[PDB]
Design a protein around this ligand. Structure first.
Ligand SMILES: CCOc1ccc2ccc(-c3nn(CC(C)C)c4ncnc(N)c34)cc2c1
Length: 460
């Protein structure tokens, strides 16, 4: 008989959203082992391969072992989902840690890139390609400072189709190898992606850039880039030589991961070296922008999900309310909330019956109602839904504050252009919405105004 994920694991909390699914911090019900589970919804993510081929890849991945590669422990599958259980890392994304440091030299970059190349080299030896390598897939193992980089998502993109949705696409275009765009690719695509990441570590700007996703993709496909920016004047010849070799257009002429590890630049800088201050500055701006556009798309999504789940939940309860007096008990609210999850797939957070009981009790305990009596469902619906959004509403706010590095209270129109370009919101569409909110021609918006624009960009 098939083994069941929630027989073995309980959810602690959501860690975040990555490629193909939500990632949840889980705990083994017997051993207390904490793990990070990536939950992939079959409704939302299509498979590329047969079951057979996926099972064999999983089995291989459970056996592979390298210090710069996320350890996979278990794999489960049921009717609606795939569950990929792996080791928890607590150090967060590499670039998030880099923006927090006072100095950053080529030696720091070389030590980072060596780790990435070492992980990749090993995976290539095992005939596993990443293809979607980017900064978000480089996690630090712990929150220490000599912490190792662990690369996540190796092998996934071969078996599951990427989302076409921008909220899931943010960041992808800078890093993708040109040959991946055209369909004929091999493991060399991962060296290209690393070259891009390295270019960014040493200058703070993407080598291939543009005002929207398609403009970025157009630059990538032409494959041309330069080292003419001022901050390249501070950088060694050997680093630009390696970059050139990694960003070589024709894959057969591009350096391999293994050979890159032997490059002069890696050798010299990983065994009287200035800080790259202008690069740190550009990376923190790049990062903040990426994080705010991401938060803007999630917020818009969250509002739409709420509009959808509010009405669904009310209809479920109306139906359930046989007598029609507006009064359900706690087990009924639970059955209805379950009914909502049965219909939805959005909550990886509500893995089993027991997580749903708990969530109901959280809402009741907020709403000043006794859990042992009968309850007005319309009031319960109102509180339950804010719970889900405000997470995104307060993360939106948090992300607006982090982007506003000067504590000015405002985002300029130029900055909005940048943010919406990354978010791939049409230029005349956002300006139009900004016209409707900025009637004083300040050419800038505060947080509430920004939020209002986003509500207008999602049909509110
Ligand atoms: C074959 C590789 O496929 C997988 C399988 C499981 C994963 C579990 C966690 C993560 C993961 N994703 N994230 C980043 C999230 C917050 C976006 C993690 N943070 C900490 N520890 C982790 N392990 C993760 C990625 C996975 C990728």
């Amino acid at each position: 008989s098939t083994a069941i994920f929630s027989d073995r694991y309980k959810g602690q909390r959501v860690l975040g959203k990555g490629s193909f699914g939500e990632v949840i911090l889980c705990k083994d019900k017997i051993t207390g082992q904490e793990c990070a589970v990536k939950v992939i919804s079959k409704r939302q993510v299509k498979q590329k391969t047969d079951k057979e081929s996926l099972l064999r890849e999983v089995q291989l991945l459970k056996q592979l072992d390298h210090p710069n590669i996320m350890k996979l422990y278990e794999f489960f599958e049921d009717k609606g989902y795939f569950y990929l259980v792996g080791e928890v890392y607590t150090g967060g994304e590499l670039f998030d840690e880099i923006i927090s440091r006072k100095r950053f030299s080529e030696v720091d970059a070389a030590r980072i890139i060596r780790q990435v190349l070492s992980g990749i080299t090993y995976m290539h030896k095992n005939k596993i390609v990443h293809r979607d390598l980017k900064p978000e897939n480089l996690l630090l193992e712990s929150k220490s400072k000599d912490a190792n980089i662990r690369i996540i998502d190796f092998g996934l993109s071969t078996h599951f189709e990427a989302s076409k949705k921008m909220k899931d696409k943010i960041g992808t275009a800078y890093y993708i190898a040109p040959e991946v765009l055209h369909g004929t690719y091999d493991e060399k695509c991962d060296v290209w992606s690393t070259g891009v990441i390295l270019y960014i570590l040493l200058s703070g700007c993407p080598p291939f850039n543009g005002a929207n996703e398609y403009d970025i993709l157009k630059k990538v496909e032409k494959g041309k880039y330069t080292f003419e920016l001022p901050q390249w004047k501070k950088v060694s010849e050997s680093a630009k030589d390696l970059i050139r070799k990694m960003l070589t257009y024709v894959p057969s002429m591009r350096i391999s991961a293994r050979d890159a590890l032997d490059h002069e630049w890696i050798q010299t800088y990983t065994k009287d070296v200035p800080s790259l201050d202008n690069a740190i500055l550009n990376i923190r701006q790049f990062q903040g922008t990426q994080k705010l556009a991401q938060a803007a798309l999630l917020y818009m999504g969250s509002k739409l999900t709420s509009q959808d789940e509010t009405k669904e939940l009310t209809a479920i309860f109306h139906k359930m309310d046989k007598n029609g007096d507006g009064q359900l008990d706690r087990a009924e609210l639970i059955e209805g909330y379950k009914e909502l999850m049965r219909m939805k797939g959005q909550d990886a957070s509500m893995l089993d019956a027991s997580a749903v009981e708990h969530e109901v009790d959280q809402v009741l305990d907020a709403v000043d109602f006794d859990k042992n009596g009968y309850i007005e469902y319309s009031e319960f619906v109102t509180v339950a839904m804010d719970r889900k959004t405000l997470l995104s509403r307060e993360r939106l706010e948090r992300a607006f504050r982090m982007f506003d590095s000067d504590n000015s209270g405002k985002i300029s129109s130029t900055e909005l252009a940048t943010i919406f370009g990354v978010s791939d919101v049409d230029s005349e569409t956002w300006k139009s919405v900004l016209s409707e909110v900025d009637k004083n021609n300040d050419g800038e918006v505060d947080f509430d105004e920004f939020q209002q624009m986003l509500l207008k960009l999602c049909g509110n």
